[PDB]
Symmetry: C2
Subunit: 697 residues, 2 copies
Amino acid sequence: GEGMWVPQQLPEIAGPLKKAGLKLSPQQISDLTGDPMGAVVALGGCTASFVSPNGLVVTNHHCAYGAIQLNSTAENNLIKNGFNAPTTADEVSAGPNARVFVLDEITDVTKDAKAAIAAAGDDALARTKALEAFEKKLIADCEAEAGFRCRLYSFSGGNTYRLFKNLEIKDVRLAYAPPGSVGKFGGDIDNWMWPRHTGDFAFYRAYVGKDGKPAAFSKDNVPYQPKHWLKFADQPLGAGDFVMVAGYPGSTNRYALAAEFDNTAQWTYPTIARHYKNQIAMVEAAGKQNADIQVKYAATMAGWNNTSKNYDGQLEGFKRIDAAGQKLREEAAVLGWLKGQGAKGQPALDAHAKLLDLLEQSKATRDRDLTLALFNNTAMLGSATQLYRLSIEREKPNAERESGYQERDLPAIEGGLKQLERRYVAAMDRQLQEYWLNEYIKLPADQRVAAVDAWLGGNDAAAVKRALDRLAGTKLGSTEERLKWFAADRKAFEASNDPAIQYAVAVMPTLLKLEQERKTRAGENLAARPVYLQALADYKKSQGEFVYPDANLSLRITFGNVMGYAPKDGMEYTPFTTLEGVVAKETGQDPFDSPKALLDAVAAKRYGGLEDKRIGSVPVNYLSDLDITGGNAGSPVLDAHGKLVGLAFDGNWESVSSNWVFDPKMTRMIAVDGRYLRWIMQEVYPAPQLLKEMNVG
Amino acid sequence: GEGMWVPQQLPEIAGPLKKAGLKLSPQQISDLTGDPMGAVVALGGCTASFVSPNGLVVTNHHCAYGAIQLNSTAENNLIKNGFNAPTTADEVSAGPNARVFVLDEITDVTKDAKAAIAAAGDDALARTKALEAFEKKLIADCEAEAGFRCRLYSFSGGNTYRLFKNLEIKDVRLAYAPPGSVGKFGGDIDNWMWPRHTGDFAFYRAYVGKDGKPAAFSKDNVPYQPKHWLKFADQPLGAGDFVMVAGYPGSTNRYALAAEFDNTAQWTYPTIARHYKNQIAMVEAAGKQNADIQVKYAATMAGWNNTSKNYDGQLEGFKRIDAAGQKLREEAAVLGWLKGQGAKGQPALDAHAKLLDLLEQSKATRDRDLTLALFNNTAMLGSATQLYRLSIEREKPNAERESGYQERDLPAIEGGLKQLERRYVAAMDRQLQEYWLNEYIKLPADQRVAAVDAWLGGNDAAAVKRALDRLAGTKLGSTEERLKWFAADRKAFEASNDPAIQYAVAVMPTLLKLEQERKTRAGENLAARPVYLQALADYKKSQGEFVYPDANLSLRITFGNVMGYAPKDGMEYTPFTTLEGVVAKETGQDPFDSPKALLDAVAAKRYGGLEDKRIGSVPVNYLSDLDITGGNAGSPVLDAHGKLVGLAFDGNWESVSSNWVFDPKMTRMIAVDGRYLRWIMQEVYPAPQLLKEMNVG
Ligand SMILES: [Zn+2]
Ligand SMILES: [Zn+2]
Ligand SMILES: [Zn+2]
Ligand SMILES: [Zn+2]
Ligand SMILES: [Zn+2]
Ligand SMILES: [Zn+2]
């Protein structure tokens, strides 16, 4: 059911947990470094979990796909064939940027955070600056012990702050991946869809140095020995059974004001989807003649195509359930209730009014803010603005520098400059500059920027065509040139007659103002947001409900049951798929082309001891009413006793609105059953050593 | 489950009945004139049932559609608006050809039948003639009492013969029909499909004369008073509940030899579907310019389009389940078993061999037999051959005349001659003569008919074009001319220089030979068929199974349970549809255009006391594993206590092979729930008087 619950509040929702089917105490699962939550690790963008005392880590195949790809060549194509390391020495590096973060300590720092906010008071902008400041110092201090990465997270509008210190494992090796036609069966056709038949799993192993401290890749490293790890279920999972997921959902906005929501649904999402569709059109079209354009923009267009399709999906989902109506009605009920109280209710009504003010402020300049951001996200101008900005930031003490522009950020920046080249064609990027300058000249005139008009030398298509011509003389199309500028101080920027650099110098005063306008609204949100949210929580209590905080990249538990859904009268989606269903989709050309050993095993009914009696086959994937979102890929699904019964890997189409709502009747997670993991590793692409290692061989 | 059981064998299948859920004794439902089977009536082509002591009869809306249409004008359009008779005087005639047949007496005449076959022995053709003879006399005698129609039916290859004497009610009036957008919701789009949301019901009332004997329509008639009638369930029907249907399925061929089946599936069905598709192509094409062609051929093309689509459906269903394989395997097992016996098994092996002989005989001339039949089914030549044939038959005593060509048949013949005109255009029919003559010249030469080649004056396209030209001089395109010939004796036929008539005179000796070849194979089938079938029954017993006879237009009981099916992994069709599902399909243009009072009632949740708690709405249609086929439309669905819970009206797509197999996992009947009948009659198109009459008002 609905909710991304923090571990610390589990004892408080004991009754609902118990009622859903949980058999462990809330106390035991409320311990983030205990059994089993201390087994759950973050990979940065994906969830994963320890599954052996010798550092074996399980996650999705699409989470590991970069690692797998990195180790693949046409000659030895792991993507297609799968990968299996018979001994730990056979295991291959996932790359320098691969991580496993294991929780080591949590601290509640709410009082210190709130003081640094308070003690620098009344002034919104300075409130935002004092919180930044507090944060940068806390992390610096916490990260003084080498081998740790620390993060500070704010809950429910900054009602609570917690510091997480994580062991940062930096040598991650690939141990196993099924063939791609298992790990990605159905491809893009079956994405977001049920029925699903995708074996979306893979295994890493975590390594440390002989001294037990994190270390970069080295053949002197040895497997990390986790304190906790998960074990495979010994009871079969069936329809109605309790399940729970632990993972790191990135963000939700479940408590947004009705007007905030209307703004996104009526302006933000349609606007961004239109832009993205337009840029896609132009890449494909340019792309059919070049061929260099269509290879270098390929990932770019895929990213825009996802978001475009995602937003369009959400917008349809909103209509389906009248999202904006329900939000309006609930909100009226909360305001009604607050008026209900006396003087007591006034603070929350104020906070609400203020939030509505802040919303109008940001709406006044929304076309401009968006257009400018995306224009500055084109290759030569992004490059120019980022580097000039770095040059300004470099002149303050590292501690006073803007996050993203610090010592620690420098390798990431330098890397993007190089990476840039793989996705940049001058002819293409000029069409994209054109596109965005034309969006800028079409803005409502009250959101023009005098600075930008000044640099353009006007505000119509003729000024734009001139500026494009002027800009084609930049040298920043060259990686050398960009690293040159990477090194340059700001007087060099302000003396440059390179037209990309002159743009950056001309717009930066404006970019900085807008930044400080954002931080000012944030400083205000800091005061009003927790107060409004506290009142939502109070009103929920009065209806006997519990509340959970919006997701914020911290570990959460969602719980519920295995169950299907019915999108139409006379029909139901059943909670499980089976082996025979994989085979019935076989074409086999991509993406419905299973390995021959799979086709044969299912044809022989070689179920390998894993058959579930209730469905009469080995289950493949399943549906349940858990509440997950981006960041939960790879998350372990556990049963009523804390044992591993699957991995989260996708949602059904009706999950696409997870940022905004949860629909008890239709929102479902799609998991791959742990029995399918085992079956694949027994009968199709065998990993006897790993099964032996996990006590199921 | 599988089986169309005759009432007399129900006590013998007591255990399976009891186990499925039946709560009445087998004894009670085995009585064809008792409670409730004596309520079930035949309409000629459709099933129906008495539902009141005052003669009210319920059936499907598509069964009553002719009656409804007959009473409709553009001004007063019952098809669209529905019809409701507030008093019995408001009830309107269903037409002179409408019937309700009520069972009055059954007799087992097996011994007399078998004697007349035996006593005229050894000779196959004469066996066929003696059975014809026996039959014509039995019926004549039985029908001596005015007001009765009698029928003789042969069971399991003529192992048993029963005589049914039925009261023939001839004044049938329409009492109620819902609007067409209920009675035919979904139209042709939802035909053969689930999910289904069609209120396919209508009500007649049966009338007799003031003396209680059948009579043709007259305002002096009064309602017939049936001895038994059905009552509406007082328990809600749910998933898994026992259901049974009683009705008059026309024909099945469940025990066909594997080779008989291969012949149909590999030759008959594909051949006929091809022909029908070709003739359709030519009607549409000619039809777009005429407009008179496309109106007069409209029903013709619909008939060909059904059969074509039906056959294509069956052929796909056969592949889906490997029908030909299963038949082969079962058959091998039966032959195996028979060899298993000693001398005892030899008669059945002989019978089988003989059946296989008879099959080869008919296969030797199958292209010819088919081509000639369909050529003689064109308007001018059918007309010519039927009338010449009548002229020959007229010269023997009525008793010795061929069935179809007797005194009793004469009005039917005269009517077709007139009706002909509504579906005949000379230009069109000439293209159809052309089509068929070209099929004839393309035959394998070993199936040519010297007679036909003789009349053509050759056997190629030039002879065909000449014959078409010759034939366009017929006068039989005129209804007058045809009635003229209706009256004519055979010397007049044999002296005619009308080219249609000259064809008839030239081919008749051949048509008569082929007829006698058919009756000869039949006479043989009479001896070998029951013996093979008896051995199938014996082999079934040895596996502990019961056997049912192929359908033959007599009353049968099928039983089973309410249940869905799952055509694909991860998905199921649920056994019920609901009101909200009707509304969710609303477009409303035809055929998804429900009455506004339906849309409003569902929107208000005016469930009228009929809501089933398990589904949370009023059920609309449901699925079950009963075994029905053509003739079962309108059949009452009864529950475990013999109460009315619905009417059969269609099958799911996987039912399309009902003539040949039954698939326990996929074959389903679609019924309209009796609660939906009541709901429509309470909330949408009200019939309070009828609900009061049936004790649910
Ligand atoms: Zn237990
Ligand atoms: Zn442990
Ligand atoms: Zn099994
Ligand atoms: Zn009872
Ligand atoms: Zn009765
Ligand atoms: Zn209700």
